[PDB]
Amino acid sequence: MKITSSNFATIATSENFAKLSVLPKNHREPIKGLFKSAVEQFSSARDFFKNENYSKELAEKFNKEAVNEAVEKLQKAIDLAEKQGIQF
């Protein structure tokens, strides 16, 4: 699979997160850690604009990295879980 800003909210869902339980502890922990971290970073990607200490141009710069960083993590999460054969 490939993740962009268009499908990130669609793939980072509770059903996919729940179906990571069958994984063994060896690989389950890093995959969930990457996936949960990606969700948290992306869910607050626009939070920068709501602070008086951040300029709009700076907030634009922060928002682009926040989405780019979070998309990268879930791509790693799917890639490693698909390596273990997940019915994503």
């Binding site: 909210a9 992306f42 607050s44 990607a45 626009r46 200490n53 709009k56 141009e57 700076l58 928002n63």
Partner: protein, 1000 residues
């Protein structure tokens, strides 16, 4: 077959006593079946009383903060390297950055110096966070930052670096903050302005590496902070019109008004007014709902805090977060008049997508460009609901008419008890109460597994359960107050009756107290009472003013000292009824004047002059524990567990006062030793509080007041049976010998009571001691740390590493402590000037057992062992310690604690040695030696002596050092074996492990 028994429990912050008492088919106990005690470590810090997870939380915060600092330093280094400022990641950049930053002003710096100051700005960036809200720590930091900001706005300090090199390092001698100081902390905005000023000045001064994009990226780094029944259709966003409307509907239909038991839902006419407040007001509070509706003072909402306005004025029902956020962003920069079907799309656009382009493409059609600007610049939506979009548009029009969730769901879509479930931790904030109830649940499950379903569960909650740390500490304070008061009262009694025969009974002290408080006169008659005649039997008695049969009140407020002359005429009425107060007779008025002129407290005065019986309420208040934990436990046990009892009070939580009364009149009041067994006592008595027993007690009180020779007991010889079954070492022998006339007490279930202690087998813990020493002296086994003068006492003085280098230092510091009587602060509170200023000088300490930390350049003391491996070598016992740092490193030690020698060469647990077993803290061991045998819980290992401490199962004062056998050596012992115990104290038997397990 399964028995018919009542289970009594006694709960306290660190213990759970339990009794199993057989009952007949009536509510009448027959004989004691079983009894036991389970202890556990109080679920809070042993001394400070903070949460046990608070240290872990602070450690997580520190680790994360350091990790973020390292990450942003890495990113700054890489960015400088890519922009060619940094030749490579590691160059020895200059160390005078502060003087370089000011030199960077009004001069140009080379590439190395410029990189150094840039990385220094990134590393030390300052505070961001109106003002003056909560804390003194904040207060100090903010005061320092504000003073520095005030100072910076002068011509002499163009930037914080100039302020540091001008104001800081001429009056204090140092740039950085020293000790607990915040006077040198700077604002993030001030340092950002400094960086912008440096870029602007260096640009004009010929610096090539001062790009606009470089400035922007460095601002980004120095300013960044991490922010804090349906079909296939996906769930809806939380910050949408439909979802917020849904939640408001649920809250509006979940409203109940309680007016002295008249708990009712809103009138349907009243609900229309509340329908749309949140659209008009951003955060309607409980003040708004009470003011708009037709309510009054004696009316409050469920979930009450508790009239007091702040409880209700500052409590929000539903916050239209999305609605008013969009309102403010659209008004500050179309109008707020919007159609729901567009608000939902806006919310979904900002919840599913966070980039400008995606949300612009998703909402290109139904949104104008200025609205796009207003929403894009200042909006952020986060979470989602657990209900699909299509479901909401149908469910909302139904619940707006006064429906419920499941009822509307059924209209749209029509289509474990035997044991106690786990404690609902969301209903219990207290970790201590949570652990107490968890252990109670474990005890109940064990008892049910051993005997079956109980007919009833009776509960005795300790006074200190369900309280904060400070509340229990003040309870301890006033407990000692009462202790000194009672011993002083005994002394005063001995003064007033010198010819007494020793220790007074409990009745006599209260007789003297009442004699004092009623001013040597009886209340009812008014006759004068003589102090010298006070102690003969029959002269006076302590009488319940309000009868006990009618009130069940054993409190001090119900006792009056009364001559036996007049109680022969009264019976069991109240003083109003007895003295004909309804007609306002001379008797009642004289008695009322007499009681009101006494030294009684007001509550006692009004309880004596009651005029009202209120039997049902008073008795129910006096007999049952009304606290939160008691009510919750009754509800939880009744609803979630199976009890074979007839009625609706299958669970009984008795008031502690009635339990004390029963324990006193049943003969076993002060039958409690200093061991942990005494808890069981209370369980037994609370297990015997069946309604038939209380009726028997009421009838006996009716006898002794106005109408069995002695106070009822559950059966004959109850006191001694309970005492033997709880405290005897071999209760069978004592029961058969000292109590021959009661063969029923000795049965198949009679076993010696063994107290079961909670296991502690966790392998995770604190890695080492926080104090970090330097590791280059371990080859001789000594600890070199910086020793502050203000902390250095006389002993630390001689253990210095400089008495061999500066005898003048040693001698002068010695006499300084002499002149202050061994007080370090008093001597060196004045700047100590060496023959330079001395604030802390390195010292030496004992260090021969340490963990290597700080990339191998530091050492620390071991914190706590998590396992002890017992081996047999050469026919003798050896003990290998296993700490947490060994577990984390995954190493399996082979060195056993040997005495007079250090771990450099201990006894090696080689192939010649045989692994016996492993021990975790608070594990049961049996040790037989040439002298005696001890069966006790393992309580640590001494690394130096190689000896162990084991805990007596009940902590008797008569055994060991206050209950623990300290310093027991096992090298030459006969047998040292590990055992196992159930939660009920049963099944003490040998356990033989097969293989030595790894640490990970």
């Amino acid at each position: 077959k399964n028995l018919n028994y009542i289970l009594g429990l006694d709960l306290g912050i660190a213990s759970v006593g339990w009794a199993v008492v057989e009952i007949d088919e009536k509510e009448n106990p027959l004989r004691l079946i079983d009894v036991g005690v389970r202890t556990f470590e109080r679920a809070e810090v042993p001394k400070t009383g903070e949460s046990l997870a608070l240290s872990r939380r602070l450690a997580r915060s520190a680790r994360r903060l350091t990790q973020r600092r390292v990450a942003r330093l890495k990113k700054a280094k890489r960015l400088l390297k890519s922009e060619n400022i940094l030749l490579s990641t590691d160059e020895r950049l200059p160390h005078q950055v502060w003087q370089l930053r000011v030199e960077g002003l009004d001069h140009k710096l080379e590439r190395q110096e410029w990189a150094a100051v840039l990385l220094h700005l990134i590393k030390h960036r300052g505070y961001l966070s109106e003002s003056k809200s909560e804390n003194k720590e904040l207060g100090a930091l903010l005061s320092g930052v504000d003073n520095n900001h005030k100072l910076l706005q002068q011509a002499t300090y163009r930037s914080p670096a100039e302020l540091a090199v001008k104001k800081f390092e001429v009056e204090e001698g140092h740039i950085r903050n020293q000790q607990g100081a915040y006077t040198h902390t700077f604002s993030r905005l001030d340092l950002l302005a400094e960086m912008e000023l440096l870029f602007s000045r260096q640009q004009h001064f010929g610096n090539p590496f001062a790009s606009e994009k470089l400035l922007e990226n460095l601002t980004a780094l120095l300013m960044w902070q991490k922010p804090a029944t349906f079909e296939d259709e996906y769930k809806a966003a939380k910050n949408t019109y439909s979802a917020e409307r849904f939640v408001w509907i649920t809250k509006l239909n979940n409203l109940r008004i309680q007016e002295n038991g008249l708990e009712r839902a809103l009138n349907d006419n009243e609900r229309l007014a509340l329908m749309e407040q949140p659209y008009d007001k951003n955060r309607l509070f409980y003040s708004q709902v009470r003011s708009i509706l037709k309510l009054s003072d004696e009316a409050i909402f469920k979930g009450l805090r508790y009239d007091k306005k702040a409880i209700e004025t500052k409590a929000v029902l539903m916050e239209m977060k999305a609605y008013h956020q969009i309102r403010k962003v659209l008004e500050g920069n179309a109008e707020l008049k919007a159609n729901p079907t567009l608000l939902d799309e806006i919310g979904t656009a900002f919840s599913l997508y966070k980039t400008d382009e995606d949300i612009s493409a998703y909402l290109a059609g139904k949104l104008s460009q200025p609205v796009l600007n207003a929403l894009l610049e200042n909006l952020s939506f986060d979470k989602f609901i657990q209900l699909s979009l299509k479901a909401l548009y149908k469910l909302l029009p139904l619940m707006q008419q006064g429906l419920r969730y499941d009822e509307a769901c059924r209209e749209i879509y029509g289509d474990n008890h035997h044991f106690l479930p786990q404690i609902p931790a969301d209903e219990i904030r207290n970790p201590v109460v949570l652990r107490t109830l968890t252990q109670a649940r474990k005890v109940i499950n064990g008892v049910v597994r051993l005997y079956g379903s109980p007919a009833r569960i009776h509960i005795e909650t300790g006074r200190e359960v369900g309280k904060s740390y400070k509340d229990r500490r003040e309870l301890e304070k006033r407990q000692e107050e009462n202790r000194k008061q009672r011993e002083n009262a005994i002394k005063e009694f001995k003064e007033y009756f010198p010819h007494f025969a020793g220790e007074p009974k409990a009745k006599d002290i209260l007789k003297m107290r009442l004699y004092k408080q009623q001013n040597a006169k009886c209340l009812y008659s008014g006759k004068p009472i003589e102090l010298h005649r006070l102690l003969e039997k029959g002269y006076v008695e302590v009488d319940h003013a309000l009868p006990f049969s009618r009130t069940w009140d054993d409190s001090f407020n119900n006792k009056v000292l009364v001559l036996a002359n007049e109680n022969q005429n009264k019976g069991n009425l109240t003083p109003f009824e007895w003295l004909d107060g309804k007609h306002n007779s001379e008797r009642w008025r004289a008695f009322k004047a007499l009681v009101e002129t006494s030294a009684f407290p007001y509550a006692k005065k009004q309880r004596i002059l009651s005029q009202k019986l209120d039997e049902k309420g008073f008795i129910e208040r006096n007999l049952n524990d009304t606290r939160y934990v008691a009510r919750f436990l009754c509800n939880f046990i009744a609803d979630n567990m199976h009890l074979t009892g007839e009625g609706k009070r299958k669970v009984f939580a008795s008031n502690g006062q009635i339990t004390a009364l029963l324990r006193s009149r049943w003969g076993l009041a002060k039958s409690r030793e200093d061991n942990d067994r005494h808890h069981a006592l209370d369980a037994v008595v609370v297990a015997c509080s069946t309604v038939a027993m209380q009726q028997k007690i009421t009838r006996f009180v009716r006898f002794e007041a106005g109408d069995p020779l002695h106070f009822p007991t559950p059966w004959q010889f109850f006191k001694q049976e309970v005492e033997i079954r709880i405290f005897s070492d071999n209760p069978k022998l004592e029961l058969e010998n000292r109590l021959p006339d009661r063969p029923q007490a000795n049965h198949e279930f009679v076993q010696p009571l063994f107290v079961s202690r909670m296991p502690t087998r966790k392998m995770t813990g604190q890695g080492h001691m926080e104090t970090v020493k330097s590791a280059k002296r371990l080859n001789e086994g000594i600890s070199v740390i910086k020793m502050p003068l203000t902390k250095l006492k006389l002993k630390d003085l001689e253990l210095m590493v400089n008495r061999e280098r500066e005898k003048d230092l040693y001698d002068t510091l010695k006499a300084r402590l002499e002149a202050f009587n061994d007080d370090p602060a008093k001597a060196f509170a004045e700047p100590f000037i060496k023959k330079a200023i001395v604030k802390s000088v390195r010292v030496e300490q004992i260090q021969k057992s340490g963990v290597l930390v700080r990339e191998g350049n530091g050492v620390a003391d071991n914190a706590s062992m998590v396992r002890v491996d017992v081996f047999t070598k050469g026919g003798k016992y050896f003990l290998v310690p296993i700490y947490t740092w060994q577990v984390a490193k995954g190493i399996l030690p082979n060195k056993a604690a040997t005495q007079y020698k250090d771990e450099e060469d201990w006894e090696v647990m080689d192939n010649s040695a045989t692994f016996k077993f492993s021990l975790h803290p608070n594990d049961l061991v049996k040790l037989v030696t040439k002298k005696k045998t001890i069966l006790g819980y393992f309580n640590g290992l001494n690394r130096a002596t190689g000896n162990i401490d084991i805990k007596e199962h009940d902590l008797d004062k008569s055994k060991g050092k206050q209950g623990i056998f300290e310093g027991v050596g096992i090298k030459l012992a006969l047998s040292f074996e590990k055992y196992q115990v159930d939660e009920l104290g049963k099944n003490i038997r040998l356990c033989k492990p097969s293989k030595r397990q790894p640490v990970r």
